[PDB]
Design an enzyme around this catalytic site. Structure first.
Site, PDB file in Angstrom:
ATOM      1  N   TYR A 230       0.886  -1.060   0.428  1.00  0.00           N
ATOM      2  CA  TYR A 230      -0.225  -0.205  -0.147  1.00  0.00           C
ATOM      3  C   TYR A 230       1.274   1.083  -0.063  1.00  0.00           C
ATOM      4  O   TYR A 230       2.315   1.292   1.002  1.00  0.00           O
ATOM      5  CB  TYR A 230      -0.658   0.269   1.052  1.00  0.00           C
ATOM      6  CG  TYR A 230      -1.746  -1.060   1.430  1.00  0.00           C
ATOM      7  CD1 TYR A 230      -1.460  -2.129   1.876  1.00  0.00           C
ATOM      8  CD2 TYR A 230      -3.856  -0.682   1.498  1.00  0.00           C
ATOM      9  CE1 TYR A 230      -2.216  -4.169   1.916  1.00  0.00           C
ATOM     10  CE2 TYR A 230      -4.418  -1.966   1.527  1.00  0.00           C
ATOM     11  CZ  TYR A 230      -3.540  -3.259   1.888  1.00  0.00           C
ATOM     12  OH  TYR A 230      -4.491  -4.000   1.566  1.00  0.00           O
ATOM     13  N   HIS A 237      -7.194  -0.263  -0.911  1.00  0.00           N
ATOM     14  CA  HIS A 237      -6.901  -1.552  -2.080  1.00  0.00           C
ATOM     15  C   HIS A 237      -4.832  -1.347  -1.883  1.00  0.00           C
ATOM     16  O   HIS A 237      -4.586  -0.432  -2.523  1.00  0.00           O
ATOM     17  CB  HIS A 237      -7.633  -1.925  -2.848  1.00  0.00           C
ATOM     18  CG  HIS A 237      -8.926  -2.147  -2.804  1.00  0.00           C
ATOM     19  ND1 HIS A 237      -9.290  -2.942  -2.602  1.00  0.00           N
ATOM     20  CD2 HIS A 237      -9.900  -1.770  -3.296  1.00  0.00           C
ATOM     21  CE1 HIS A 237     -11.273  -2.762  -2.191  1.00  0.00           C
ATOM     22  NE2 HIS A 237     -11.105  -2.094  -2.653  1.00  0.00           N
ATOM     23  N   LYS A 266      -3.999  -4.312  -9.476  1.00  0.00           N
ATOM     24  CA  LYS A 266      -2.886  -4.515  -9.089  1.00  0.00           C
ATOM     25  C   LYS A 266      -1.973  -4.603 -10.522  1.00  0.00           C
ATOM     26  O   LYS A 266      -2.680  -5.031 -11.680  1.00  0.00           O
ATOM     27  CB  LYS A 266      -3.022  -4.928  -7.522  1.00  0.00           C
ATOM     28  CG  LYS A 266      -3.861  -4.580  -7.042  1.00  0.00           C
ATOM     29  CD  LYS A 266      -3.798  -6.209  -5.827  1.00  0.00           C
ATOM     30  CE  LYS A 266      -4.834  -6.048  -4.976  1.00  0.00           C
ATOM     31  NZ  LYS A 266      -4.748  -4.856  -4.306  1.00  0.00           N
TER      32      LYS A 266
END
EC number: 4.6.1.16
Length: 290
Positions: A230, A237, A266
């Protein structure tokens, strides 16, 4: 009669009575040598599918199709139909919009050995791939520098191994570890970190480098990666999915990661200790080009 050209030992006939300059003029490919049109393996095949030329011998098509590979061909065609000026050589496919610097495309195959070093001394701008359904996929890899916006502090705590897992006191950085009956359940990496064994292993070295950058590192197993990270405080997320590229690597792994990553929105980051340092390389699907 039909004007004809030749692609290295392969004579073809131009369809529908078209001048050789028609082809040259219209598809910006080939040249004249005597009263023949000289097409390279790709161009020839290309035009063949355009229904623009026929073959003297039946084998030719197959032969040339084998000569150039399906993978390399599909790339050629797509880039061509899209509009670029293509040209293959040196084992790379170069393409330009017109007169600017070309761009190198690198046709890959799931079982080709991939190495971090390659991803950093990148001679090519893109990596190409065609799957079992003729579907193409372009990728791009560039050295990245993860920027964590988190307040970092030195954490040197006591660790205890019990029940087959490692634990620490229930106060360390709220984010490091997991809450378990007043204790803190650790990961093998988190243990080594506050335990002061940053050099334990390469994944450990990256783990520290990572945390030290203001990032928060949590295991990324639910994704097949060493860890998720993160970049911000209130991050719902994890933006990054990082994995340490082992000794020997196969492309499908790279290919694989990029997928399970984009899926969960991601970014695949591959870390490694290149030249005494912990650098990262982001790999992602590329649209526009194809």
């Amino acid at each position: 009669h039909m004007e004809q050209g030749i692609c290295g030992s392969h004579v073809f006939f131009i369809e529908d009575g078209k001048s050789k300059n028609y082809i040259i003029g219209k598809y910006k490919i080939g040249y004249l040598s005597g009263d023949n049109l000289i097409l390279d393996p790709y161009e020839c095949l290309y035009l063949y599918f355009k229904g623009r030329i026929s073959f003297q011998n039946s084998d030719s098509f197959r032969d040339l199709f084998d000569t150039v590979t399906f993978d390399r061909y599909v790339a050629y065609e797509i880039l061509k139909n899209k509009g670029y000026r293509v040209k293959e050589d040196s084992g790379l496919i170069y393409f330009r919009k017109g007169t600017e610097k070309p761009l190198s495309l690198r046709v890959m195959r799931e079982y080709d050995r991939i190495q971090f070093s390659d991803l950093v001394e990148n001679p090519v701008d893109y990596y190409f791939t065609v799957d079992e359904e003729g579907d193409p996929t372009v990728y791009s890899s560039q050295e990245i520098f993860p920027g964590g916006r988190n307040l970092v502090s030195p954490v040197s705590a006591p660790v205890v191994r019990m029940g087959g897992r490692s634990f620490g006191a229930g106060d360390l950085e709220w984010w490091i570890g997991t809450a378990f009956h007043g204790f803190r359940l650790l990961t093998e990496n988190e243990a080594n970190y506050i335990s002061g064994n940053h050099s334990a292993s390469q994944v450990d070295m990256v783990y520290s480098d990572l945390v030290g950058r203001g990032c928060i590192v949590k295991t990324g197993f639910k994704y097949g990666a060493n860890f998720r990270v993160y970049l911000g405080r209130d991050s719902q997320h994890a933006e990054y999915l990082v994995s340490v590229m082992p000794e020997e690597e196969r492309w499908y792994s790279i290919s694989r990661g990029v997928r399970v990553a984009s899926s969960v929105r991601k970014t695949m980051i591959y870390a490694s200790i290149y030249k005494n340092e912990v650098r990262y390389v982001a790999l992602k699907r590329v649209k526009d080009i194809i």
